[PDB]
């Protein structure tokens, strides 16, 4: 999660994503315990999604799902050259659940087909 490069268009920021990252009970002690669980829990959630779709540790993951124009209507150049990431994710915030389901189903279908090839 690199804040900074958040005001740039999608194409520019994508190039610059070179690196991703790197008891007692008292008022402070309880807060520290809650802070730890919050982070562990959060990391696991994104990882669970990524893995189900088959990405598994790749920052850029290519998926076989086609793009339906009922999600967006614009061209590649309009989307990448002049839209920042916080604008695009707000612009397609109504079709994330369906997209997630479609990628999960497609990954499962690809997973099933391979077993057939191996016999």
């Amino acid at each position, epitope marked *: 999660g690199f804040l900074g490069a958040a005001g740039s268009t999608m194409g520019a920021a994508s190039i610059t994503l070179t690196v991703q990252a790197r008891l007692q009970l008292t008022v402070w002690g309880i807060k520290q315990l809650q802070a730890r669980v919050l982070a562990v829990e959060r990391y696991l959630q994104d990882q669970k999604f990524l893995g189900l779709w088959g990405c598994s540790g790749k920052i850029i993951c290519c998926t076989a799902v086609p793009w339906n124009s009922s999600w967006s209507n614009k061209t590649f150049e309009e989307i990448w050259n002049n839209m920042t990431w*916080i*604008e695009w994710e*707000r612009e397609i*915030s109504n079709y994330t659940s369906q997209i997630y389901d479609i990628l999960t189903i497609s990954q499962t279908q690809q997973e099933k087909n391979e077993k057939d090839l191996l016999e």
Partner: nanobody
Amino acid sequence: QIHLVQSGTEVKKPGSSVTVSCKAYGVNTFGLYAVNWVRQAPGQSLEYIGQIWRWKSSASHHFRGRVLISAVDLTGSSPPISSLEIKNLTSDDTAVYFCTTTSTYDRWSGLHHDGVMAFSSWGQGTLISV
């Protein structure tokens, strides 16, 4: 709560100039909120004239050069005030007018998108006929 009030009716003649000012009660600052000017011709549908967003003024191409938009925020004695001035008045300018305000604190609410918005609160009206 939120309430808008504007000036009364006026009966003018061509070649004159009139100004309508809306005072907003319950709007903390015009920095967070946005002010949009809409004119409704009698019978005909509503139309968009201009706006002040983050202290920058603009008007529609059709109304540009004849409309002036200005705003001042909270003063111990007064509520935030926004004003529109028609210039070089003509017969086509006969309509009720409205001044509106929309929250723009957070970008994930859907009411505003890039300066184009759905106006949440609409003032009462100031009928102007010539």
